[PDB]
Amino acid sequence: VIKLHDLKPAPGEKKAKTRVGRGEGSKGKTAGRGTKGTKARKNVPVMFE
């Protein structure tokens, strides 16, 4: 018997989103951008070497 409550997503379909910057517990204070730098502020184009 299938009720609307027993539905199960398949193992591995649901990968949790990565909420960058939410405490030193997981991703803290720099959001995986390292310390100061251009990538630390906005970005650099796809082109300029």
Q: How far is the CB of 41 from RNA (least distance, A)?
A: 3
Instruction: Verify binding: residue 34, Mg ion, rule CB under 5 A.
Output: yes
Instruction: Verify binding: residue 23, RNA, rule CB under 7 A.
Output: yes
The number of helices, as runs of H, and strands, as runs of E, in the chain is 1, 0
Burial (Cβ within 10 Å: 0-12, 13-18, ≥19) of residue 14: exposed
- In the complex, which residues of this chain contact RNA (CB under 7 A)? 19, 21-31, 36-42, 44, 48-49
Q: Where along the sequence are the contacts to Mg ion (CB under 5 A)?
A: 34, 37, 42
